[PDB]
């Protein structure tokens, strides 16, 4: 204030008062407080797996029993990453791969009727959410709005990756039946792993009575 | 999944601290957050929007005045914990009173 | 033709299970006898 | 894009031995519209 | 937990901390916003910089710190290193010129306090679009895109308040997107309330007449659905194909389009284009085909045009 | 030409995820009813994925 005469002691944020010609300082500082997956991407980057192993080695043996159980179980995953695994920063996505089109197609059925792989509406939903997030940052970012949209974005990533883990997303108010996710196609009744073992139809074949 | 992969790697009981923060707007501190609360910097720890709003906005507060009463607006400089501001206007938040919108001058 | 039928090539189930896993962010590589990269998509 | 015709797919479903032309018929009938 | 009530107690909690006083608190914020409006413009003259550049450096310093780099005309710039160069070139402008800054800060920050308080409006606007083709959170966020897009434009000078000025823009971004992202195909802006209008005569004839009478719209069925005795089949499993190459498409339209413009230009452009673009550009009609002639001469010249176009004597 | 004796599953860096891909899905546009043909930069693009 005044160019050097006054200097605010306490930590806080600045208010400039134009009438009574004063400056207020309300309790705060840069509090680097984050929410959502953006926070956890950092917490994985900032991680010393070597140290966490050397650390976990000590909580393992030295604290008495009935406590080291969770330390062992926690040591397995750290020791798994340190081996021929990878860095955990990867465990959160900022790039979503799109499956090729012909594996989950769109077709034109009785002249004017279509059939749709549920993945395609799950992929559209995420293109929706991601694009609205972009435009909401350019057009001003009132936080609780940007946070709703990011929540919607995680919810639609969890959607096309794996439904039924958080309550399932439906197509319309008529076929209230979970959309088939990237997880459904790699397990279950037919899936990808099982169906090859389970047996397919066969061209050069026949029946008759014997 | 059945063993938390991130929740066992990162340090948070593996179950709720996650569910709480990824999906909602709840928060963990990262890095130095100097400011006060019932303790100093909580390097790794979580909090609500309630106590996060008391660390970003501060401790504002609103106290209504029926159209005609005014006790100590001239005390537009200072206030204590639980102070009288009008017949039926107490103020437990401890701070500095401040004129919002005048009527009579 | 009058030829013999050749097996693959690569099999359909194998290429699909790669890219279909690849739809989730899983890096699935194929390796040689010594650990070495093998492109299974025929150039 | 890509084309298809339901009449031939339905006959194939009927041949495949899944259910009787009754259930497949109810299916194509719900397929038609609501 | 379940995210139905969480956005509600997230809205209704700062809307409960700031339920705007309909005149004092509402008009105070809109002024500061316009206070910051012109103060940025006057700062654009003193410094020689883009106005929306300046508004955006203000936004970054108000929210503490963010990475939201986007500007019309400019897409990016060194954010955390240069915004403070901008803030210190502002520390050099004297007492006359820094008050524009002080007002520009208070104005854009009030812009957020304005919005954050008026979101319970959006809650009850999108509540009359429940079963329309978008989830209730897509609707509010399209509604929150409108109430933000209404803050660029509001003029407090004219005395009508913001509670009724923003209902229009909110209900304009909602009806923007329902016409877009509801079905798989990007549906016409038209067909929305053409499909919506038959659905409200169908329920005013089926109330009584009991009949289903005489005289480009349907809803997709998913690819995987257990057919039969609710068994393991998926419905894509019984679809064989019609053909792979899909010929007479590209080689046809290539002839088709070029041999059109040939005859299309060899007669009068006032003749051939009346139908080139009526039957071919947007819609259809011939009650208003006419750019200004009788409904009888357009039919006259239309038909007579094609005839000399069909065969030339 | 070379044999496939081993398969390994790892976690894919987003820098990888960008490598396997050919271009980005831009718009939530599948195909329009007027022309049964891929829309502007949609889920069924031909530049991105290949010719139907």
Swiss-Prot record, chain B:
DNA-dependent RNA polymerase catalyzes the transcription of DNA into RNA using the four ribonucleoside triphosphates as substrates. Belongs to the RNA polymerase beta' chain family. This is DNA-directed RNA polymerase subunit beta'. The RNAP catalytic core consists of 2 alpha, 1 beta, 1 beta' and 1 omega subunit. When a sigma factor is associated with the core the holoenzyme is formed, which can initiate transcription. The lineage of its organism: Bacteria, Thermotogati, Deinococcota, Deinococci, Thermales. It comes from the Bacteria.
UniProtKB/Swiss-Prot annotation, chain C:
The chain holds residues 1072 to 1114 of 1119 of the full protein. The RNAP catalytic core consists of 2 alpha, 1 beta, 1 beta' and 1 omega subunit. When a sigma factor is associated with the core the holoenzyme is formed, which can initiate transcription. This is DNA-directed RNA polymerase subunit beta. DNA-dependent RNA polymerase catalyzes the transcription of DNA into RNA using the four ribonucleoside triphosphates as substrates. It comes from Thermus thermophilus (strain ATCC 27634 / DSM 579 / HB8). It comes from the Bacteria. Belongs to the RNA polymerase beta chain family.
UniProtKB/Swiss-Prot annotation, chain F:
Coiled coil: none annotated. The RNAP catalytic core consists of 2 alpha, 1 beta, 1 beta' and 1 omega subunit. When a sigma factor is associated with the core the holoenzyme is formed, which can initiate transcription. DNA-dependent RNA polymerase catalyzes the transcription of DNA into RNA using the four ribonucleoside triphosphates as substrates. Belongs to the RNA polymerase beta' chain family. This is DNA-directed RNA polymerase subunit beta'. It comes from Thermus thermophilus (strain ATCC 27634 / DSM 579 / HB8). The gene is rpoC. The chain holds residues 2 to 53 of 1524 of the full protein.
């Amino acid at each position: 204030a005044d160019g050097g005469k006054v200097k605010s002691d306490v930590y806080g944020r600045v208010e400039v008062d134009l009438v009574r010609n004063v400056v207020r300082v309300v309790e705060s500082y840069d509090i680097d407080a984050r929410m959502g997956a953006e926070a956890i991407q950092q917490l994985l980057k900032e991680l010393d797996l070597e140290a966490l192993e050397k650390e976990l080695l000590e909580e393992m043996k030295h604290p008495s029993r009935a406590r080291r159980a969770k330390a062992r179980k926690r040591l397995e995953v750290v020791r798994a990453f340190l081996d021929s695994g990878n860095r955990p920063e990867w465990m959160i996505l900022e790039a979503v791969p799109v499956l090729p089109p012909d594996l989950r197609p769109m077709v034109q059925v009785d002249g004017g009727r279509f059939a749709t792989s549920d993945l395609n509406d799950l992929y559209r939903r995420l293109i929706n959410r991601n694009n609205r997030l972009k435009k909401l940052l350019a057009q001003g970012a009132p936080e609780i709005i940007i946070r709703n949209e990011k929540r919607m974005l995680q919810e639609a990533v969890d959607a096309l990756l794996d439904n039924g883990r958080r309550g399932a997303p439906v197509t319309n108010p008529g076929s209230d039946r979970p959309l088939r996710s990237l997880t459904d196609i790699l397990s279950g009744k037919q899936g990808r792993f099982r169906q090859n073992l389970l047996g397919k139809r066969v061209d050069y074949s026949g029946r008759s009575v014997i | 999944d059945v063993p938390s992969k991130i929740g066992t790697l990162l340090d948070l009981s593996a179950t709720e601290l996650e569910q709480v923060l990824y999906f909602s707007k709840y928060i963990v501190l990262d890095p130095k957050g100097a400011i006060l609360n019932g303790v100093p910097v909580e390097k790794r720890q979580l909090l609500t929007d309630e106590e996060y709003r008391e660390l970003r906005y501060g401790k504002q507060e609103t106290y209504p005045l029926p159209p005609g009463v005014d006790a100590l607006v001239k005390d537009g400089e200072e206030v204590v914990k639980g102070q009288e501001l009008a017949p039926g206007v107490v103020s437990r938040l401890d701070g500095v009173a401040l004129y919002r919108f005048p009527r009579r001058v | 033709k009058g030829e013999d039928v050749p097996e693959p090539s690569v099999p359909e189930s194998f290429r699909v299970l790669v890219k279909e896993l690849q739809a989730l962010a899983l890096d699935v590589q194929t390796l040689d006898e010594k650990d070495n990269p093998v492109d299974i998509f025929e150039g | 894009m890509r084309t298809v015709s339901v009449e031939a797919i339905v006959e194939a479903l009927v041949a495949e031995g899944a259910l009787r032309p009754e259930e497949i018929a109810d299916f194509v009938e719900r397929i038609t519209t609501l | 937990k379940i995210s139905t009530s969480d956005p509600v107690r997230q809205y209704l909690h700062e809307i409960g901390q700031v339920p705007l006083l309909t005149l004092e608190e509402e008009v105070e914020l809109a002024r500061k916003v316009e206070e910051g409006m012109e103060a940025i413009k006057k700062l654009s003259e003193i410094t020689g910089l883009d106005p929306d550049l300046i508004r955006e450096v203000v936004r970054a310093k108000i929210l503490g710190s963010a990475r939201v780099r986007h500007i019309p005309g400019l897409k990016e710039t060194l954010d955390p290193k240069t915004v403070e160069e901008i803030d210190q070139k502002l520390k050099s402008l004297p007492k006359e010129h820094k008050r524009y800054l002080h007002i520009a800060r208070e104005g854009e920050a009030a812009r957020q306090h304005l919005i954050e308080a008026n979101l319970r409006l959006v809650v009850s606007i999108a509540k009359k679009y429940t079963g329309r083709g978008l989830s209730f959170l897509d609707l509010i966020q399209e509604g929150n895109q409108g109430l933000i897009r209404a803050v660029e434009k509001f003029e407090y000078k004219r005395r009508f308040k913001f509670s009724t000025y923003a209902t229009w823009w909110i209900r304009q971004a909602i009806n923007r997107a329902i016409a877009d992202q509801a079905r798989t195909i990007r549906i016409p802006v038209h067909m929305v309330e053409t499909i919506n209008k038959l659905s409200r005569t169908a329920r005013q004839l089926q109330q009584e007449l009991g009949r289903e009478p005489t005289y480009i719209a349907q809803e997709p069925v998913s690819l995987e659905t257990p057919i039969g005795d609710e068994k393991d089949s998926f419905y894509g499993d019984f679809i064989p194909d019609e053909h792979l190459p899909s010929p007479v498409d590209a080689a046809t339209q290539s002839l088709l389009s070029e041999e059109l413009e040939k005859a299309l230009s060899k007669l009068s452009e006032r003749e051939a284009m009346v139908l080139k673009l009526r039957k071919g550009l947007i819609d259809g009609e011939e009650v208003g085909a006419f750019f200004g002639v009788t409904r009888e001469r357009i039919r006259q010249i239309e038909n007579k045009a094609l005839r000399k176009l069909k065969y030339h004597e | 030409k070379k044999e496939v004796r081993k398969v390994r599953i790892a976690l894919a860096s987003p820098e990888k995820i960008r490598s396997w891909s050919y271009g980005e899905v831009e718009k939530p546009e599948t195909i329009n009813y007027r022309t049964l043909k891929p829309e502007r930069d949609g889920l069924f693009d031909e530049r991105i994925f290949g010719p139907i």
